[PDB]
Amino acid sequence: KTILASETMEIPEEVTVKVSAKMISVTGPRGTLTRNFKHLNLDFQLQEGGRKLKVDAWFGTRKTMAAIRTAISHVQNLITGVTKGFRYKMRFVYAHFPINASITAANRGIEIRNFLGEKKVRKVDMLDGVTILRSEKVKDEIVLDGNDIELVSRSAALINQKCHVKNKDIRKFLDGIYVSDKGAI
RNA sequence: GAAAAGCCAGUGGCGCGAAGCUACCGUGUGCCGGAUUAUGACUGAACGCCUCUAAGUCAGAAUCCAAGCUAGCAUGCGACG
Ligand SMILES: [Mg+2]
Incomplete structure (x- = not known):
């Protein structure tokens, strides 16, 4: 019923946005990101020669x-992801059993062992554009890096939801893997 | 006639009895991908914040559909002699 609802952003000078009818390809120093907004039924249009995206x-x-x-x-998240990137921190909370994490292959997945004293070995592989590394200046973290927030945050969520504590009081057995500093640097 | 060999008693009766069938009374085997629910979530609005939901995604089960197994006159079809 509303004639016009428009929003606008600014594109920095280090990142090139190429919108192709809804197929947004963003290019920056770190790499490239891409996305279908082909479902949004909006209108994308670049102005000032690629410096302003107006929707x-x-x-x-x-x-x-x-x-x-x-x-x-x-598209803000794409711009920040491909100029700086996203880096999630993920701390190890263990009550009695130290849980022992080992990376898989050139930082593309983690392997959690000795969680809750269990003998099942927890295996998660990083999605495409995300890597992992154990923290070294912090006590017990794993730090994920990536250019795409969806991929970083999904990988974080797989690691989190694959260490749940079952059949016991989740109010007391707080063991698991949880995310602490979620900014973008 | 008798020994030998039988035969009659609807299978004379007993002991054993291969073969064939057979028994959880014996043996052998029994199944691999994806979609997804309940739920937990990711990014993110509306609502400068928050939000698993509105758009878009994830993990997910004795579930589902296949895979496998059985018939395949479905008056169906293919290659060939
Ligand atoms: Mg016998």
Whole structure:
């Protein structure tokens, strides 16, 4: 019912955005990111020669109007991911059994052992654009690095949800792997 | 006639009895991918914040559909002699 709902962002001078009808390819110093917003039913248009991305919803109801800022902050996340990158920190909480993590192959996955005294060995492989490394200036962290927030955060979530404590009081047996500093550096 | 060999008693009766069938009373074997629910989540709005949800995604089960197993006159079809 609303004639025009538009939002706009700014593109820095280190990153090149190439939008192809909704197929957004972002290029930066760190690499390249890409995404289908081919489902959003919005209007993307670059102005000032690739320095301003301006998004329209014409006759958008409040639902489509809420869909706008998703696209704008998604492409913010791509811009920051491909200029600086995302780096999640993930601390080891263990009550009685030290849980012993070992990387898999050139930092593409982790292997958790001795969790809860269990003998099942926990194996998670990093998704495409994410790597892992054990923390060395911190006591017990694993630090994930990547250019894509979805890939970093999904890998973080796999590691988290693969160390749940079952059949026991989750209010007391707090063992697991949880994320502490989630910014982007 | 008798020994020998039998035969009659609907299978005369008993001991054993191969073969064939057979028994959890004996033996051998029984199944590999993906979708997903309940739930837990990721990025992220509406609502400068938050948010598993609105758009988009994930993990997920004696579940589901295949894979496998059985029939395949489905008046179906292919190669060839
Ligand atoms: Mg016998």
